[PDB]
Structures are given as structure tokens and as C-alpha cells.
């Protein structure tokens, strides 16, 4: 068997990690203190859920995670939270000074003092595992500790462990959730830096999830807890293949072979259904063909784009719960007789489907409801290029004036980094246009 390690950097990163671990403990039945009454092989062994939890002498299931932050404020809530007995004190790494939303600081000044400790902690955590698969890093692009330090750690992990995958779960910022005007400046830098040290990357448009929470979940002003719960649900639906011995996507190296036909192109599109509110617990029922037809909707995707124009390179469907193969075939025939779709004929990948016979789960007392079946579609598409056309555009709006750029140069990096980064963006856009034909 093989396990995995998840490094959570930044505020959004540690929040998403905490939500994911809470959902995992609620699904597997692990109590906050770390007591699994369903587990019988104490001490250690090999199980489906052993790929993300280490067993101790007292039967404690310690999550295989590393929460690092450049500020003690955020980690204080985790240390004093209800799950204080779940995570180990050493796994939580804190810093005395933050990046102040700066990439140069997180990649040079503050990063050079904490990168060594992070690497030592990762090595200590990996010593217990007999076979590691990759490193599921969680960050975003609107901060300086999520881009700078993430790229700095990727640069070292590509040298220490080169034979291990490196999956990411980035968060695409939005102009309504933006906390700084140099938020793009950080994004471009870390994007250009992790291109050769990342196999598959998952981006979350903040505006898309905000609109989903406002419409589906029916919330007046969705907060960061409402968006951290949905990201945890997505992460659980995606990792069920590794946490329940799923047939499709059994390991991390398969994500690059199924959803990444091209090395440079590694930004699939992930959509999930359904999204019922807690109030409408038993109002309507959705079949296996009514939830698979809701994952081909622009408003249901995690990134605002128009896949109907471009063409798809890959496609992987994952059902979770009561789903019969006949229903899956009927839904496929419906999707193949109703919607018009284009596909790359010279791509070395195609359509794949997998099922996981496990009941869904939702945080009790939350805004989500318990459904009987769920679907998650991961499809790489050229329409994601649109998501870039916006980002790069803002960069130009900040390049003609060179505003707030001296702050980044007066910390470590030089000036050619921006030209290299925008030159890497132009090449990516050209490759996207070529693949789209």
C-alpha cells in the first residue's frame, strides 16, 4: 500500500485542510479525539483509510497532514479548536512575520527561514510511511504565503523527491473577494514557478463558488466557512477514489495519465452535483441522469467559461452512492443523444467512468443536505484558457504603470521575472490555441 501527505499553507489553505479533515473524520466515524470504533486492527497494518491516517500505540488516528502558516493567529484557532486532540502539536508550524501579500517575501525573506523547518517536518513525517505517492499541496494566488512559499517548497520537493507526484488545489481569485490589488502579481509568479513541479492543478473560481452558495445553498452573504465546506466536499468526492479503493484513479500517477494528456496543459475542469439546501431535505429527487446532465452546465462548473465553444481533451466521471450500472449507461446515452459536444480525435485519452458504493455525508447542522447519490466530473478543456485571458489582462493593466512592482524587486527577485512569467503565459496561451485548432 501507499499513503499520501497533504501540506496546507496560507489561511485559505489551512482552512480547507481543516474542513477536509473534519469531513473525513465524520465520514470514517473517527471521533474528534481520534477513536475509530469500527477499526479492529490496532497498532498498524493496511486498510483503505490508512492512506491518510497514521495509527499509534493508543489507537490514535493522526491525520497525515502538515499545517504551516507564517502567522500564529490562524494556527491558534486550530490549536484551541475542537479538533486539538486530532492533529499533533509538531505538525502545526507557525511564523512570526507574514508576507503582507507579497511573493518576493514569501519566496525569499520569510520563506528562507521556514523552508528548512518545513522540509525537516515533511521528512520526519514521511519516515513512518513505507511508500509515498505524492504531495497534495493546498494554496491560493491572492496572498504572499500561498504563492511564494508554495513555489519555494515545490522547488525543493522536485529535488528531494523527484519520483513522486505533486498535485495541487489552487484557488483562482476573484475581483469581489480580492483583498489586495497586487493579488494578480502573486498569481502569475507562482503559476510560472510550479509549471515544471506539478502534474495536475485544481483551480477554484471564487466568484463561481460565491454564486453557487448564493443560488443553490440560498445564502444572502456567503462567508469563508460556506466556501470552505464546499471545497471540502469537492476534495472528498475527488479523493474517495484513493480513500475507498476505487477502481478509477487508484493512485496519484493516474491523474496525470487520465486528465493530463499534455505536460504543459494541466488545469482540468472539476464540477460536482447535486447542491441541495438544508431546508429542502426531502423536496425533490434527482436520478443518475438528472445529476449527470447538471454537470454539463456552465453555472454548475467551478470556473466561469463556455465549454460549448471549445473541445474536451479528457473526461472522468465519478459517482458516489446508490448508482446502478444501468442508470449510468442510461445517463450516458441521454448525454450522448441530447447535448452536442466536441472532442479531440488525436488525444491519447478518452472518457472514463467510476463508481464508489458509499453513502454521501454532510456536516450536521450546516447548510448542505444529505443526498442519496452524487456525481463529480473532471474534464480538461480549452475553455479554461478564457479564465487566463482575464488574469493576464489585469497584469497588463498593472504593467503599463509598474505600480507596486518596486516592492517586489526590493526584496530578492529582479525585474526579468515578470518578463519570463508573462512570456510563459504567452506560450501557454499559444499552446491552448493550437490544441483548440
Amino acid at each position: 500500500m501507499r499513503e499520501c501527505i497533504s501540506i496546507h499553507v496560507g489561511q485559505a489553505g489551512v482552512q480547507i485542510g481543516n474542513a477536509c479533515w473534519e469531513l473525513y473524520c465524520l465520514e470514517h466515524g473517527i471521533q474528534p479525539d481520534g477513536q475509530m470504533p469500527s477499526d479492529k486492527t490496532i497498532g498498524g497494518g493496511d486498510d483503505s483509510f490508512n492512506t491518510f491516517f497514521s495509527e499509534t500505540g493508543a489507537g490514535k488516528h493522526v491525520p497525515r497532514a502538515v499545517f504551516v502558516d507564517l502567522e500564529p493567529t490562524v494556527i491558534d484557532e486550530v490549536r484551541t479548536g475542537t479538533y486539538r486532540q486530532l492533529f499533533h502539536p509538531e505538525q502545526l508550524i507557525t511564523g512570526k512575520e507574514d508576507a503582507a501579500n507579497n511573493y518576493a517575501r514569501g519566496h525569499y525573506t520569510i520563506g528562507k527561514e521556514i523552508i528548512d523547518l518545513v522540509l525537516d517536518r515533511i521528512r520526519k513525517l514521511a519516515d513512518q510511511c513505507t511508500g509515498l505517492q505524492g504531495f497534495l499541496v493546498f494554496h491560493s494566488f491572492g496572498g504572499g504565503t500561498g504563492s511564494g512559499f508554495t513555489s519555494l517548497l515545490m522547488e525543493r520537493l522536485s529535488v528531494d523527491y523527484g519520483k513522486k507526484s505533486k498535485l495541487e488545489f489552487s484557488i483562482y481569485p476573484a475581483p469581489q473577494v480580492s483583498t489586495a490589488v497586487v493579488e494578480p502579481y502573486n498569481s502569475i509568479l507562482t503559476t510560472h514557478t510550479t509549471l515544471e513541479h506539478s502534474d495536475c492543478a485544481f483551480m477554484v473560481d471564487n466568484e463561481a463558488i460565491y454564486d453557487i452558495c448564493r443560488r443553490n445553498l440560498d445564502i444572502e452573504r456567503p462567508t469563508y466557512t460556506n466556501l470552505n465546506r464546499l471545497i471540502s466536499q469537492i476534495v472528498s468526492s475527488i479523493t474517495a477514489s484513493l480513500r475507498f479503493d476505487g477502481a478509477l484513479n487508484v493512485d496519484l500517477t493516474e491523474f496525470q495519465t487520465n486528465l493530463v494528456p499534455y505536460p504543459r496543459i494541466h488545469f482540468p475542469l472539476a464540477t460536482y452535483a447535486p447542491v441541495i439546501s438544508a431546508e429542502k431535505a426531502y423536496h425533490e429527487q434527482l436520478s443518475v441522469a438528472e445529476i449527470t446532465n447538471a454537470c454539463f452546465e456552465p453555472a454548475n462548473q467551478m470556473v466561469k467559461c463556455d465549454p460549448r465553444h471549445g473541445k474536451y481533451m479528457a473526461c472522468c466521471l465519478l459517482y458516489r452512492g446508490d448508482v446502478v450500472p444501468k442508470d449510468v449507461n442510461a445517463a450516458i446515452a441521454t448525454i450522448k443523444t441530447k447535448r452536442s459536444i466536441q472532442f479531440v480525435d488525436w488525444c491519447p485519452t478518452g472518457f472514463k467512468v467510476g463508481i464508489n458504493y458509499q453513502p454521501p455525508t454532510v456536516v450536521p447542522g450546516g447548510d448542505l443536505a444529505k443526498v442519496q447519490r452524487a456525481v463529480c466530473m473532471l474534464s480538461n478543456t480549452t475553455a479554461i484558457a478564457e479564465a487566463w485571458a482575464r488574469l493576464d489582462h489585469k497584469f497588463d493593466l498593472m504593467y503599463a504603470k509598474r505600480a507596486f512592482v518596486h516592492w517586489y524587486v526590493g526584496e530578492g527577485m529582479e525585474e526579468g521575472e515578470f518578463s519570463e512569467a508573462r512570456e510563459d503565459m504567452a506560450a501557454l496561451e499559444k499552446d491552448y490555441e493550437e490544441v483548440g485548432v
Binding site: L217, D218, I219, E220, R221, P222, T223, T225, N226, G246, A247, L248, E279, A281, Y282, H283, Q285, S287, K311, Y312, G321, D322, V323, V324, P325, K326, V328, N329, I332, A333, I335, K336, I341, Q342, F343, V344, D345, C347, T349, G350, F351, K352, V353, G354, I355, Y357, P359, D367, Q372, R373
Partner: protein
């Protein structure tokens, strides 16, 4: 359970289907079944389900040919571990005055939407599940007649939505519930709620354990609703999005601050946490808006010359506590309604 498409330009390769079909072929290992549109008209021979799959935890016999209610109780009896039971969109014929108990003790959730059951019928139907923790009775045109006696005392969920015959007189009958922790009332036509048993500044004895009151898409046009909501003893959560009083317009926040100002223990509104900053903003707006009227109603900072009328108190029963929390409004704070020439 026991029993090629070519999209775009690539085939559809299925993997792992054999594992699922071999896992579902096991009837003694079924933890949840959702028989929808399966055309279930009868239960069949007795004992067959008690030995084939007697360990089912969830059943959803919605949209079937179930005629009589006994056909459902027969299936529920053989299942000694029935934790969830949903039979919506079925025209069941329940008894007239018979109670079937000793068959749903392990039932924690019950759903009977669009079933056509009335109040007198459901009162006896729920007798078999005295330890029921959740109950859903929406979209049924139910008309409450009298309050339950020894039935539904462990139910913490009362979903009474899509019922246009649920007035406050009918809600008073279900307010006696001792463990009712939630009450849904969306799309019911309610327009006002009163509690004459209590006065201004007191706590009503009704709804002792109510913690979440959902009244979204209702006839809430008067501020008296939120003012009376203050009397609830444990109203921690509230929900109200589309009312004659609540708008989706950008200028609706002005009303939100008032809602939080009408309830004291409202820590969450419309599925959003409330902070001290939010509480203070909403409390400063309520005083800034209702200061002028407090002067005309006979108000004065003098602790012995404060003589307010009854209408101003009934309309603002949460304005006297704020007068002491942040002092009374000054004369220079009530002169911002004139332009310049």
C-alpha cells in the same frame, strides 16, 4: 440490484463496474435502497424480506403503486433496523382510528410528503415510532384540528411547508412540543404571529426549545413579526429571504440591521454568522433611525423624566435596553434630514 455509446470522437470505457454489481448482488449487505418508479403495489409473501435483507438502514419507496398503508407497515416490520423511511408521492389509505405500534421504534426519520395524510391520521400513524427524531409533512394540505396527546414528544423536526392552512392558531397547538428543536414554515401564507400570554420584556412559554424558525417566502410585511419573535426563549437562528419586508435589492441591508436589532440572541441570520462588529453596527443604526421618534414619544435623557407612550414601546420594545447600552441619543444626532440653499 441483483439484475456501446460513442460520445464526441472517443469510446466510453467502463472500469470497476463488475466490483459494484458484485457488491450490490449481495442482498445481506444492503445498507441503503432507493426504489423509485419501481411500481411497488404490495409487500409480497411474509418472512421473505425478514431473511433476504433484514439489515436495511434506509428505504425510499417514493412514487410507487402503494395503495393501502398496511402494505408499507408490513415491509417496515420485517426490517428491524429501519432508520430512515420515505414514502412520498403515494396515495396511501391510512386507517380511520387504529394505532399500529411496536413496529417503528428504531425509526429516527419519517417523510410523508404528497401522501395526502391529514392530522388525525398522521397522529395515529406516528404512534408506532415514539422515538421519532424527525418528521416531514409538507405538500399535503393538512389542517390541524387539536394538539397531540402523548404522540410526537421526541420529534425535533416539524416541516409544515406548502400548506396554505397553517395559521398562528394552528401553530399554538404544536408550540407545546417539549423537544421540538426546529419548525419549517416556508410557503404557508402566514402573515403575523402573536403571543398574548406574555407582555413586553417577558419570555413566552410557547416553543420552549425552538432554535430555528424558517418562514422564507411568506407574508411578512409588518415589523410586528420580528418584534414578537423576541419573546421566543431559545430563538438562536432565523431565516427570511423573500418577503414584502425583505428584498433581494441592494438596499435591503437597511432592513437586515433592524432584524438583528429586534432579536437579542440572534447569533445567525440567513445562514450567516453574526459578530460583535455586526451586532454593534445594527444596534447603532436602530438608535440612529428611531431616535427622532423617541423624542416625540415623550423621551428624555433624565432618568426620572422619561415617560414614553405605549405605541412607541409596542413598536420598539428593544429601544429601552439600547438606551442604556450606549446612552440616549443627543440633540445634535437628530438633525440630519435637511438640504442646503
Amino acid at each position: 440490484y441483483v439484475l456501446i455509446v460513442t460520445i464526441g470522437n472517443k469510446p466510453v470505457e467502463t472500469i470497476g463496474f463488475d466490483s459494484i454489481m458484485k457488491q450490490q448482488s449481495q442482498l445481506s449487505k444492503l445498507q441503503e435502497v432507493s426504489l423509485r418508479n419501481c411500481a411497488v403495489s404490495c409487500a409480497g409473501e411474509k418472512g421473505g424480506v425478514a431473511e433476504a435483507c433484514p439489515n436495511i438502514r434506509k428505504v425510499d419507496l417514493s412514487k410507487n403503486l402503494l395503495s393501502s398503508w398496511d402494505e408499507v407497515i408490513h415491509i417496515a416490520d420485517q426490517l428491524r433496523h429501519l432508520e430512515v423511511l420515505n414514502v412520498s408521492e403515494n396515495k396511501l389509505k391510512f386507517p380511520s382510528g387504529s394505532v399500529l405500534t411496536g413496529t417503528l421504534s428504531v425509526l429516527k426519520v419519517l417523510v410523508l410528503n404528497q401522501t395526502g395524510i391529514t392530522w388525525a391520521e398522521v397522529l395515529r400513524c406516528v404512534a408506532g415510532c415514539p422515538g421519532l427524531e424527525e418528521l416531514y409533512l409538507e405538500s399535503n394540505n393538512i389542517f390541524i384540528s387539536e394538539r397531540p396527546t402523548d404522540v410526537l414528544q421526541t420529534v425535533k423536526l416539524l416541516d409544515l411547508s406548502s400548506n396554505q392552512l397553517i395559521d398562528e392558531n394552528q401553530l399554538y397547538l404544536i408550540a407545546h412540543l417539549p423537544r421540538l428543536e426546529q419548525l419549517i414554515l416556508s410557503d404557508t401564507g402566514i402573515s403575523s404571529l402573536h403571543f398574548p400570554d406574555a407582555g413586553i420584556g417577558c419570555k413566552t412559554s410557547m416553543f420552549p426549545s425552538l432554535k430555528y424558525l424558517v418562514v422564507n417566502d411568506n407574508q411578512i410585511s409588518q415589523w410586528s413579526f420580528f418584534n414578537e419573535l423576541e419573546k421566543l426563549p431559545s430563538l438562536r437562528a432565523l431565516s427570511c429571504l423573500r418577503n414584502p419586508l425583505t428584498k433581494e435589492d441592494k438596499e435591503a441591508e437597511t432592513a437586515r440591521l433592524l432584524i438583528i436589532a429586534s432579536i437579542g440572541q440572534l447569533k445567525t441570520l440567513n445562514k450567516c454568522e453574526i459578530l460583535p462588529e455586526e451586532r454593534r453596527r445594527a444596534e447603532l443604526d436602530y438608535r440612529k433611525a428611531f431616535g427622532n421618534e423617541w423624542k416625540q414619544a415623550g423621551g428624555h435623557k433624565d432618568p426620572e423624566k422619561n415617560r414614553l407612550s405605549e405605541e412607541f414601546l409596542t413598536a420598539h420594545p428593544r429601544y429601552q435596553f439600547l438606551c442604556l447600552k450606549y446612552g440616549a441619543p443627543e440633540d445634535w444626532e437628530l438633525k440630519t434630514q435637511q438640504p442646503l440653499m
